[PDB]
Amino acid sequence: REIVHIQAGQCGNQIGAKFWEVISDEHGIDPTGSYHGDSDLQLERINVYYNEAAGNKYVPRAILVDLEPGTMDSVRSGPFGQIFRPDNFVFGQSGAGNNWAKGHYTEGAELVDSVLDVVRKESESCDCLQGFQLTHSLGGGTGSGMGTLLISKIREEYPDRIMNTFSVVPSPKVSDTVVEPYNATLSVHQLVENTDETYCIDNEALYDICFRTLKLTTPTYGDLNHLVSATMSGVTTCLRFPGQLNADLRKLAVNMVPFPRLHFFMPGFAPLTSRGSQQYRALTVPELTQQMFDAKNMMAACDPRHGRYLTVAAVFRGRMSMKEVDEQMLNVQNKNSSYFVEWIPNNVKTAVCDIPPRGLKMSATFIGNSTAIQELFKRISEQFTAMFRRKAFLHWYTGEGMDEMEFTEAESNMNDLVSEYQQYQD
Amino acid sequence: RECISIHVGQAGVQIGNACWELYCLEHGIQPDGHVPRAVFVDLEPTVIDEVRTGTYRQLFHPEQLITGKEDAANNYARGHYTIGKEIIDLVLDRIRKLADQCTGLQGFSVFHSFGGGTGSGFTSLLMERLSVDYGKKSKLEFSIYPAPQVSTAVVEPYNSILTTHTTLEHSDCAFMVDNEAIYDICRRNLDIERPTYTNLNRLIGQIVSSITASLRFDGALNVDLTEFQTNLVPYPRGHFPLATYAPVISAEKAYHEQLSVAEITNACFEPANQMVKCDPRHGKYMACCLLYRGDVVPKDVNAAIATIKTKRTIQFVDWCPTGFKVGINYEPPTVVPGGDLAKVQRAVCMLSNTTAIAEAWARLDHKFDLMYAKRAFVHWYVGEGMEEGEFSEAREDMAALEKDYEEVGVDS
Amino acid sequence: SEKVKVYLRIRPFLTSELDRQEDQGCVCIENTETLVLQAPQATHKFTFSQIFGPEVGQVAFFNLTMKEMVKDVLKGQNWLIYTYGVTNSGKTYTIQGTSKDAGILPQSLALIFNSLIRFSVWISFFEIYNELLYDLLEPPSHKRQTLRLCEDQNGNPYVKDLNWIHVRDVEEAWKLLKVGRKNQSFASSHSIFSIRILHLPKISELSLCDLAGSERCKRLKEAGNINTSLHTLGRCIAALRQNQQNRSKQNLIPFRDSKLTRVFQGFFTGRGRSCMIVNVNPCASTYDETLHAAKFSALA
Numbered sequence A: 001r002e003i004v005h006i007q008a009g010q011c012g013n014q015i016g017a018k019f020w021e022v023i024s025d026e027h028g029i030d031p032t033g034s035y036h037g038d039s040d041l042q043l044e045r046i047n048v049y050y051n052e053a054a055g056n057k058y059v060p061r062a063i064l065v066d067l068e069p070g071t072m073d074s075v076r077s078g079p080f081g082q083i084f085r086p087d088n089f090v091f092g093q094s095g096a097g098n099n100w101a102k103g104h105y106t107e108g109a110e111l112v113d114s115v116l117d118v119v120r121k122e123s124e125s126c127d128c129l130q131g132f133q134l135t136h137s138l139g140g141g142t143g144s145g146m147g148t149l150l151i152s153k154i155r156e157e158y159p160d161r162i163m164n165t166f167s168v169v170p171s172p173k174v175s176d177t178v179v180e181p182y183n184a185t186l187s188v189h190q191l192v193e194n195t196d197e198t199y200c201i202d203n204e205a206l207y208d209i210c211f212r213t214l215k216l217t218t219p220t221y222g223d224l225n226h227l228v229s230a231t232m233s234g235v236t237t238c239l240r241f242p243g244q245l246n247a248d249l250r251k252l253a254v255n256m257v258p259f260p261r262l263h264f265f266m267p268g269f270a271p272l273t274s275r276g277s278q279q280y281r282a283l284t285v286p287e288l289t290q291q292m293f294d295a296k297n298m299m300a301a302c303d304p305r306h307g308r309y310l311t312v313a314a315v316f317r318g319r320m321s322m323k324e325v326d327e328q329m330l331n332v333q334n335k336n337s338s339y340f341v342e343w344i345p346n347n348v349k350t351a352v353c354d355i356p357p358r359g360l361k362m363s364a365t366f367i368g369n370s371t372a373i374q375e376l377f378k379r380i381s382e383q384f385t386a387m388f389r390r391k392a393f394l395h396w397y398t399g400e401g402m403d404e405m406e407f408t409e410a411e412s413n414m415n416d417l418v419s420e421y422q423q424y425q426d
Numbered sequence B: 001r002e003c004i005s006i007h008v009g010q011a012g013v014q015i016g017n018a019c020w021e022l023y024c025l026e027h028g029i030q031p032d033g034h035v036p037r038a039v040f041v042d043l044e045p046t047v048i049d050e051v052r053t054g055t056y057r058q059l060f061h062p063e064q065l066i067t068g069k070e071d072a073a074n075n076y077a078r079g080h081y082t083i084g085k086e087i088i089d090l091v092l093d094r095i096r097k098l099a100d101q102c103t104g105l106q107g108f109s110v111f112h113s114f115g116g117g118t119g120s121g122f123t124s125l126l127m128e129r130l131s132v133d134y135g136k137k138s139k140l141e142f143s144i145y146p147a148p149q150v151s152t153a154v155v156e157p158y159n160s161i162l163t164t165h166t167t168l169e170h171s172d173c174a175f176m177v178d179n180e181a182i183y184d185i186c187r188r189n190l191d192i193e194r195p196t197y198t199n200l201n202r203l204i205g206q207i208v209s210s211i212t213a214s215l216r217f218d219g220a221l222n223v224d225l226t227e228f229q230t231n232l233v234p235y236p237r238g239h240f241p242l243a244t245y246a247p248v249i250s251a252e253k254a255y256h257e258q259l260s261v262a263e264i265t266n267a268c269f270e271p272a273n274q275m276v277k278c279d280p281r282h283g284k285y286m287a288c289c290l291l292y293r294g295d296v297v298p299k300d301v302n303a304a305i306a307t308i309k310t311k312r313t314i315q316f317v318d319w320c321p322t323g324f325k326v327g328i329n330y331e332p333p334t335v336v337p338g339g340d341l342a343k344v345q346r347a348v349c350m351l352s353n354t355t356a357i358a359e360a361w362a363r364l365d366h367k368f369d370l371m372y373a374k375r376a377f378v379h380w381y382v383g384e385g386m387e388e389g390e391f392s393e394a395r396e397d398m399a400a401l402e403k404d405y406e407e408v409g410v411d412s
Numbered sequence C: 001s002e003k004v005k006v007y008l009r010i011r012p013f014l015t016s017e018l019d020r021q022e023d024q025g026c027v028c029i030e031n032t033e034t035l036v037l038q039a040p041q042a043t044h045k046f047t048f049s050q051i052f053g054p055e056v057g058q059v060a061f062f063n064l065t066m067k068e069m070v071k072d073v074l075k076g077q078n079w080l081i082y083t084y085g086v087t088n089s090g091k092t093y094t095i096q097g098t099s100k101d102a103g104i105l106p107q108s109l110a111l112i113f114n115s116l117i118r119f120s121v122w123i124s125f126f127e128i129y130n131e132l133l134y135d136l137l138e139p140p141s142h143k144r145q146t147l148r149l150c151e152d153q154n155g156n157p158y159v160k161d162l163n164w165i166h167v168r169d170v171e172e173a174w175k176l177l178k179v180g181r182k183n184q185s186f187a188s189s190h191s192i193f194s195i196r197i198l199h200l201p202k203i204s205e206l207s208l209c210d211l212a213g214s215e216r217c218k219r220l221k222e223a224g225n226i227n228t229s230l231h232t233l234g235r236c237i238a239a240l241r242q243n244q245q246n247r248s249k250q251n252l253i254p255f256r257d258s259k260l261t262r263v264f265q266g267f268f269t270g271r272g273r274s275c276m277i278v279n280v281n282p283c284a285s286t287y288d289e290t291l292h293a294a295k296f297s298a299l300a
Ligand SMILES: CC(=O)O[C@H]1C(=O)[C@@]2(C)[C@H]([C@H](OC(=O)c3ccccc3)[C@]3(O)C[C@H](OC(=O)[C@H](O)[C@@H](NC(=O)c4ccccc4)c4ccccc4)C(C)=C1C3(C)C)[C@]1(OC(C)=O)CO[C@@H]1C[C@@H]2O
Pocket: A021, A022, A023, A024, A025, A026, A214, A223, A224, A226, A227, A229, A230, A231, A233, A234, A271, A272, A273, A274, A275, A276, A357, A358, A359, A360
């Protein structure tokens, strides 16, 4: 059940550095150390993300692709930056400009060939590979552009494998990039046409959660990304170990994606409280459901109330009663039946892992595919056409090699998804 | 004489190990002792490895432990077309070696969960080869029925309906147990709010032990495996009889213990204790096998059966003048030293097929149609190598079962 | 709306099949538009539009079905003819045929070129193997080719980086097909012949499709991949039916599902009229495949 992890762009690089900074403790592996885990059950599943090398040195099978050498270098000279092998370092010292076309056609394609060689080597390692996890930005050049081509080629090479993408969408309230909507519409195009699973993470969403739920007066990127790197563990690592009810990407996709349109899922975290102040330890069963199914606990700007739940995944981890979990789920599906879909008897596919997140007793990862994400699409598309009508920043793409019709096509397929989402919403 | 068990799917392996744990417990065999005639088959590597690290690690041979290193998922299509045809040959190979090992075998004891991936697709193609290469053998499967309301998977009916579609023309008799009903028994009778999966397996295994294990032992009135189907399924269809256990008293709160034959027998006709959600709404009893194990008097059984027949409340089929199979074992009902059973000196195992099965199937049938109307996650099946014909034709085929019970039953 | 014309054709019984077994025709030809189905028994009625028996020659199929298309090319409208049906039903025989009796495709060229004030025609022939588009006109045999479908402001899908050739006579296009048949690969390749005539301008593009059949008897995921393509095709056609019926039904179509349905978007729902060709086999053992195609076509 081995999987390869790929970091694309500044956003992907930064998040990847945090992910491998968290999962390292989950598996119990030091930067260049061996298995220093507390338990020994974690060792039996280290082959999912690590490649057996010098015995002591467990090398993570992650491919980091960036156009900004400085950005990638800051990771290499950081905490868990030496843990990666130089062979997996795909840096493109070319025109690192925030432009989808530039990072796809111009300076993108040239580096893609080099990336393909590395990824093909990582996939053809040992045993049987399951899929390819990717982390990128939606309003960037390397993240939205290069990453998009990476997935396009990967799905072409291994259509038998699944793809799980983690993408941070453009902040609706305060966009971090000027040409953000321009890159977003283009990146989301290849996403729906290529990847099978995708999790959306909002900028201000993390801010709000780290403000109301968590008492963090200064939620820097290192703080926000940390939370994101905790959700992915429940979707990946947590689904690698044994439990009362095991699940995986196959189990998830088949019980989450109702159509061949990918569908964007919204992530959440059950054990979300402060350090000592909120140390109530209220993590039995109903408290988790109350947290996971919270309109202000979603890592996305779109709230669950602005739509209906198409399919929900419950990835629990720790010792608990199966009957208690499922019983509580029924309660939620009954109380919130109005927006829990009426064309599917059971929309929640329960799953319970037998191992908690180290220093945590009770935990659960929330994965919900709801039509509420439709609001996000309409929001991004709105901003796109607003500037596309004027073609203000069009020349930045035209000079690279971007078709006029390409831009309109990306939006037309995106709008297509919005239209179909509503069909299942009613 | 002997019977080979085939546990397919996660639940199949879990229940199989728990069932066999009880099997050797009463046999008086320790972890490191004979060779069990059973194999574990699952595409999920983590499930099979549980027996390789947990209890009875040195009791089973690696040859009896088929393990896939790929992904099974929860889709019938995968375990039937995609990866199913990759391990099936190896599975058949092992069960064939075991079949030849035993001199004059009776049949196979299948164990699986209707709601799953390996427990659905794998079972379907496995039984397919069994009915062709071992048509002269008794095919008795123990199918775990998904909960009517507390479903475990979203594509639950999608996998279950297809499994029973093909297996209906393969297995001679399939003993179905309701997942949710086990919880009911643990709540009302066992009186516990902590009914773990492993706790459910304790009850199901207790039934199997009395259906095969003790019944294979020289008692007072043994019932052969062939006799089972001969007196359970009056039609050449894979009908599904219920599994009821009389002693459901918990060894803690209630402590009657000394219960007469009349009471134990009467405790197998109540909806509160049937191990199935097929409540006696209007279901007529066509064939009921009563396996008594322990200190029981034949005359006491005859009297208990007679009084029930004249109860009238328990309506039998019009064309069924006498539908009671009397089974008498000399081996008492053993109980796990650390379980939740009170341990009685006599147990009654009731296994009967009623028209109530149609009601249960109708619920799942509707569940399939509901999602099928919009196809739902059909792509996760079609892309595996299944056409609409594997769904539409199955839909009609399974629908014939609702009509089957409707004709076999109800009509005078 | 227009309706996709529906045509059914059954394979004839030769001395070979007669020698092997009865091979009784389960499908009876009732009227030129409908069919009575008695399959050893099952009763069903096929209401297509046009149906020809095993007696008619290969030219006969083209004479009625393909002739109406030849007229539309002059009209300026695009047309797509796709041959669908069970395995080894003779679809390739009906579409290509032989030198003596040419199929709908070769005969189409004969009539269209005969019909063709200056006229111009572009010829394109390619094979789609494993969802890969391979040009039969230029390359020798089975490399990834660099082409995508872009969607213009008109909403019409266009395949980019396609090969185009100018042909004077019909034999020139026929010769190109010979090359395509020679370079052709097969499954364990979709052959699509595209003909675009310029009326001088009004341009009409025609395309022929003939599904090769891979049925498993008891590459990478070739079975599952296409299985999905046929699945979306069936669902898309179903949506096309309800939306064309015109009570008031706006349903979104799963065109994005597979690349196949995506590429043929312009032919079905876009600028172009299409014809449905259903070739079936009278054999009783083949009824399994027939049952699906029957239900798919006729509504029971
Ligand atoms: C004394 C004690 O019990 O401390 C707890 C703690 O106080 C709390 C507040 C932790 C704490 O988490 C945060 O404050 C936090 C900071 C940035 C972003 C997100 C969260 C904690 O830092 C996080 C830490 O989490 C873990 O150890 C998990 O294994 C977690 N690990 C990481 O995220 C990680 C952090 C640094 C380095 C490597 C990994 C994990 C979760 C899911 C999947 C895999 C791993 C825990 C329980 C605590 C501290 C240490 C204070 C909480 O978070 C988690 C993810 O458990 C925040 O609300 C929960 C509730 C916990 O009780």
